[PDB]
TrEMBL record, chains C, D:
<comment type="similarity">
    <text>Belongs to the protein kinase superfamily. NEK Ser/Thr protein kinase family. NIMA subfamily.</text>
</comment>
<protein>
    <recommendedName>
        <fullName>non-specific serine/threonine protein kinase</fullName>
    </recommendedName>
</protein>
Amino acid sequence: KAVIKNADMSEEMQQDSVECATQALEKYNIEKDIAAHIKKEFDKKYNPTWHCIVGRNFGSYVTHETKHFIYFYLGQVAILLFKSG
Amino acid sequence: KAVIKNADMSEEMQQDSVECATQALEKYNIEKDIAAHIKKEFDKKYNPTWHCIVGRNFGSYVTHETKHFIYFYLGQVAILLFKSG
Amino acid sequence: VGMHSKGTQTA
Amino acid sequence: VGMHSKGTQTA
């Protein structure tokens, strides 16, 4: 049930984003742990430094490296994932 | 009404965060704009690169530069502000 | 590396 | 240039 709202990344990395987040929602209930899982997977796979926010109510303003930004919904939870540093 | 929950940052810079966020909450109604305002002010004053999340429900896992992290509440909104890159 | 700022808002 | 990871969670 993935709705990508904003993305500056390749399609493959987008798809990896969605699937990594889906796995994290299957495994964890707390937003922070879901975010931790995603962030850690991405630092491992794609190199640091990634940052992830998971929640139903937030606004953000962030800065990211070219081609390394995604903001999408999975059901009712919004997920922001991006690389910086 | 600032409740600092988690901080790795000088006291002065902490107090600047809170004041900056208070001014932002007076001025803007939308979380994203509040975050935008705070992030932008911090890039100007303390050099890039800062990132800011403002909301009533989210979890996060992020990485920051030593002494450049704060997470606090201001009324019913939580604010995450940190520097990386 | 190019750096770009972005804002997001849940509805 | 030390880097540290942190998690946060709203109530």
